Amino acid sequence: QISVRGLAGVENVTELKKNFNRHLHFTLVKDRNVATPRDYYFALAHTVRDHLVGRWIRTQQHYYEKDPKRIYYLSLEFYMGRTLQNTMVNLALENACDEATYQLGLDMEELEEIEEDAGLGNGGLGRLAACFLDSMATLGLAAYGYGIRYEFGIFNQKICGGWQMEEADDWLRYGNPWEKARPEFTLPVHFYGRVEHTSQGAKWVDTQVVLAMPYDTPVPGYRNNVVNTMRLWSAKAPNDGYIQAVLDRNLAENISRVLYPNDNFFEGKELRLKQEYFVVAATLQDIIRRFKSSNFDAFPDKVAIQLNDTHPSLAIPELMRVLVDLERLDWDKAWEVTVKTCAYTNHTVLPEALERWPVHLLETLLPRHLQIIYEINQRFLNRVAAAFPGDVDRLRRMSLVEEGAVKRINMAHLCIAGSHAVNGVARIHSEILKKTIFKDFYELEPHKFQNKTNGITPRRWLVLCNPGLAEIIAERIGEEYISDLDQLRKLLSYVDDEAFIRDVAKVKQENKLKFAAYLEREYKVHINPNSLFDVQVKRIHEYKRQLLNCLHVITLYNRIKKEPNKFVVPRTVMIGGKAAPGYHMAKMIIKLITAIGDVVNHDPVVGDRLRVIFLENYRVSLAEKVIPAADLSEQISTAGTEASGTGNMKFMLNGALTIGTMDGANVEMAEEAGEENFFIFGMRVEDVDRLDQRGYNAQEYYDRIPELRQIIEQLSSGFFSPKQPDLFKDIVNMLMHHDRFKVFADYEEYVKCQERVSALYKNPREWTRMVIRNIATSGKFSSDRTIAQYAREIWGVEPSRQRLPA
Amino acid sequence: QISVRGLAGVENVTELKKNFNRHLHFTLVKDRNVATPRDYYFALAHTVRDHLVGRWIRTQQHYYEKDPKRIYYLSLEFYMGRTLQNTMVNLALENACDEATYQLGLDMEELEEIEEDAGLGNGGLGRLAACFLDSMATLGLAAYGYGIRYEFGIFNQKICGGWQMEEADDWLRYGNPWEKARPEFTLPVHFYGRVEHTSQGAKWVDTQVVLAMPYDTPVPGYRNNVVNTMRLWSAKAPNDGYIQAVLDRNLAENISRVLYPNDNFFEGKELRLKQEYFVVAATLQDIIRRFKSSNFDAFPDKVAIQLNDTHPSLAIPELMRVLVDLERLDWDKAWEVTVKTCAYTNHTVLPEALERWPVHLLETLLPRHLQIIYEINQRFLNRVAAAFPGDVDRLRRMSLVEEGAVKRINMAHLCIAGSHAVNGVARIHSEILKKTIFKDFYELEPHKFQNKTNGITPRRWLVLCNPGLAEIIAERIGEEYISDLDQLRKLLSYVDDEAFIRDVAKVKQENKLKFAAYLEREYKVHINPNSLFDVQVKRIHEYKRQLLNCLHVITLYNRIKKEPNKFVVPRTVMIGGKAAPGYHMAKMIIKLITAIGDVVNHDPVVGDRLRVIFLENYRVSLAEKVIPAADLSEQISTAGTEASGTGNMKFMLNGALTIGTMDGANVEMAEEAGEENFFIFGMRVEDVDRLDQRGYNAQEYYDRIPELRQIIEQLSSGFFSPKQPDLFKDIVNMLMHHDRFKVFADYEEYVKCQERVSALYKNPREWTRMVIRNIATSGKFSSDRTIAQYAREIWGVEPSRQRLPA
Ligand SMILES: O=C1NC(c2ccccc2)=N[C@@]12O[C@H](CO)[C@@H](O)[C@H](O)[C@H]2O
């Protein structure tokens, strides 16, 4: 149909049809009279998966022959989404499969919707891991993603009476055709026990054994015939009254049962620590086994381990344990190897998110690792003492061990000490690390600290989710940009091209019609497709300030009511996201959003000027639908709180304008497109600090802004909760007395800036010209650029766009 | 190689090799440089499974078109064993696959050994279900096996220091290629709740829901291109703090987690009752759904439900519940349908094995079913009262409800009342049912009571496990006997044929050499292959009198020691079996067996005249090895205790002579072969009763038999337990004061009879002639005969040996 989806060759199509019918008959054990649409999806999945296999086997064989340095991306989260369409795109099979399925009388798009998201992540961090895997494969790196195969990913979200309900995401119910179990690579992991010191050295004894069974999922590079591996571990009980013993095996296997959904507040839960050690222990054994199939001085020349936040920080003490206790290297040599091998990416500055494990917990579960951490801490603090003699305060601040109520291990401190490289994930965030929370460590080892601004894969996030936009771009500048996104700059030469302006606006309107229909179908309510689509989709957090958005929405409503017969640019305000299940305020915000919607969407006087929709069950596959449909991207975190963000980049790439704060990668986005092409508002980081020094008094804003005072009175008095007048008292009280994120401080500038958006939207041609200026400068935010920087500046390997043989 | 294994056609072999390599590449995702022998087994399994699929799909399609009456074999146990070889035999693919694998440089026999037993049964009852499925497919019946897919089957047995240790049988670890999940046929099962009586009728409300997900396994008939289905249900939690809720899903799924291994003593465990209801509820919904795809008056013309003992007895109240509460039939009509549909097979008379569920348990878990059982009981006892006016004692004895300490439901009583047919499983057992435990029910409804003597499938139990014996038979009389075993009588005309005598003895010696080697390899100890192979393999039970065997073995030892320099026919005594994990005495017997072995096998004076071996982990695949190797079959249960036995039949078919009591099917076996061709000894049933009336005094035997007294002194004094002198005090005490199975009463006759065995073994030619007389009359004990009798006399359908198209 469209060229960027590849060729439909006569042989190819005939072949695909033959294989499809073969899998239907032999794999599914069905005839065409009894096949459910799910059967058809599965037949297609196996058929496509068949085209991966030779490439997978040869890629892994190639790495054995060439023995390149290997990259191990260690993460607790991989937010993969659906695999079928992505696999077809990267193998150039999409048009052939569309044709082959069409000829069998099937609509491929319908079959794609049957596939479950692999929702093995919470949000940004998990998705970043998934985008990185795609880029690593595309750049021909010998890279492996290592994580946990959770039986249950992020919960499915239902709204009942405006409230979030959580449902178990039973994603494996119907089987996963993408994965291959490898029971023959099963490895023991040890817990509890105690340490004996002998003549030979320390020995970890009387441990409990849990087994780690790997499942491998293929990761295809973009049309380079490279297929890398994602290895996820599953917990299995070892095989050594009777009934209960059998049933008790469940306890060991609980380790890999369920993704922890608390992306706000670190809770030191034992099961979570078990997960962290489990993935680390199984992975390092695998790494070392592979390393030996070809003396540890060469280890860092053959192995890079990237730590996705502190979640796999125990990689550092575990590697020491294996090198010292099992391989019998002396400490210093062992340590040298560890530091040159390991590198740490920090993904937050919010202090309640930092992992600070109680010592008593580590003492019980991982006694040997605690010993090793104490030894690391001692040697580290000896280096600090030597560098800064007398600075006792510095010693306390930098210690891996935090004193107080309960002793804790600061895992971030452990990571900086045990890594040759520490990076943030946007320039402003990496600066804040060096100025504030890791200033002491920076002063000791300035050379360790880097920036690696985040990116998104243009495969999933353009070609896949927005084929029409991809096509009209390819019509002008060819297809090379898909793996070299900087080529998008060539679109600057089309900013005054009348036909390209027409094409860009047509695609957007088509995406909106498509999504408007999807709303009506799956969640039956009607929306004006000619309205401005104002979307904020991301996890629900106070710092991301969905509440600021709520205030703006109520302002528009109050203005309409006041002057009903006046023109306003009509809007559909769409807000979506999951709240962590124990995060009360986030749950109240969702409820407030739906409460506003109930009022606004049923007011006769508003009509279709204003609509407020809560998008249920925001996940990767919903993002692929709504982001192409968006006009305005809401990136309105308080300055200094969003480490980078990545949604921001998805929208830029897909033809929406951004309203946002100078936070995270927004700063670099505005810099690339020019500030005049970006709706910047609010406090800078410096402003927030100035406010904090003199003290944030929210009352001041309530007193001086009549519009704001009206909103707060409405919330209080039950305007938005008639049957429950005081439902939102927690929200008002927080906004008035305990608002860490200074919602009121940015209110005035946000509303003024939102007016400028409405003003520009009134001018289709100039809106679309501004869009082109955004799309055309979004190249920097390709994860290909990000990974190329990791490769050259941290891992010490060169990327490649050269094909492997087919 | 041998003709009964089929043809190796040039196309066939080339095809199999092609498919094998295809599955290795695409299904296993391996090349030949990294393939483990397990990969090769899996590739072969998929290849063979591919030849089942068209036949499976067409068979099920045929049943839809023809809409024959359908047989539902309801069992908690299916002891299937390995599927690969059996599938090849029944599809005639064995020689082709042997050749195809050979040419790929693989030994098929080695690949077969990688397959795990599907050990979803304890022993005789479970295996009978598996033999029945094979016969039902072979006789072209529209039959379905319905059970539970246990995650863990019968435990693996290890002997440590002579003691049984149990290990979880994790049979699904590496996947099951034989099964096909059918998640789209998932069905709810309800538990707990309470009953509301409305205007419409009774309503079962506030229940907990567990889901039942079916897995279908193909059941190929012998070269008739029929493939029936075995459907096994798996428990899955329904999909409607957070972490713990997710983890708690395990509790629902515990229902299908593990096979109950207590084949001796009924324990009223709730989890066991959950299993029984779970299989019954899911199955009846499936039955009814199928019935509707084509008014319930016709139900019994389209449906037969066979109950494998009382384990699925709740089928009767469940069917009433659905007909009355959900379909709104009146009671009488509902009842008529139920009785004409259901039929009950009894498989024991030992009173501690009968299922007698506490009322309080049923009350809580299945409140509605208890109501229905009480109504059944009332109507039933009204019929008894009318038939036998004034016989109040009869009323008490026949009640479904037993009074006493705790009220119980007698499930056997429920089965007789709710079934149109009740059968035993050997003539003597069916007589005992009518004379003793169900005499009252027989007097009421004489027409219900039948015999259906058990059988074994000659496919697994001759062709598969003993190809050489199958071949030399086929050389004389052709292959038709494999599905018509009565043809074996034609071998009577070869009893004086010198060459056939030679062939029969050669095959036996080859089987012994083969098994002797297997011992040395897998469990490193040496055995004289020219000794008489004396084997007793079966679950460890007091009633099966492994202890009597132990006494004989110690007698032979004591006789050798007394007269060391005298000739005795050398023997290898092999005893194997699992004890139920809580069955103390059975665990002591295993220990005694190994204790005897430790003494006998290390005595220099004994040499290789006598060896005692405990066969570890007796299971279906070990039976296929040891039974063809046996000379003497030990079937020595106390008269009246073994309902039938089926091991007995396996050995008869495979060229061993039987020493046994007139118990179970032994009676019919001796009758078929002639008593002069059978080593019969001991009390008849009548003798046991005469002893019981005057009282069993074991002391009497100890006083009068010096040889026996010596054995008891040895056991007591620690002759067989030096470091633990009183280890076997429980065994002695039981034998002397509390022996329900009268071991001493049969001792003298057993030893004399064992001498006659030794005497005949001394004469190879006459031994072998006697063997021929056994093999030649074993035809009756084909499960084909058994199932044909069920079909005609209970189910009301005609068997067929006609082929379906290929
Ligand atoms: O999405 C994110 N989750 C976490 C995080 C959550 C819990 C504990 C630790 C970190 N950090 C985040 O990483 C993304 C990827 O770098 C950034 O784009 C986000 O700004 C940042 O919020």
Ligand SMILES: O=C1NC(c2ccccc2)=N[C@@]12O[C@H](CO)[C@@H](O)[C@H](O)[C@H]2O
């Ligand atoms: O092997 C058997 N197990 C049980 C049984 C076990 C527990 C509860 C109820 C029954 N009955 C048996 O059924 C076989 C098949 O009919 C008979 O050959 C055996 O003689 C008989 O012992």
Ligand SMILES: *Cc1c(COP(=O)(O)O)cnc(C)c1O
């Ligand atoms: C990209 C993405 C995120 C991260 O979005 P931010 O706006 O950076 O928080 C979260 N969830 C999903 C499903 C995504 O696709």
Ligand SMILES: *Cc1c(COP(=O)(O)O)cnc(C)c1O
């Ligand atoms: C046939 C068989 C049994 C039943 O044997 P009996 O001697 O009748 O008790 C038990 N277990 C296995 C593995 C079998 O193959």
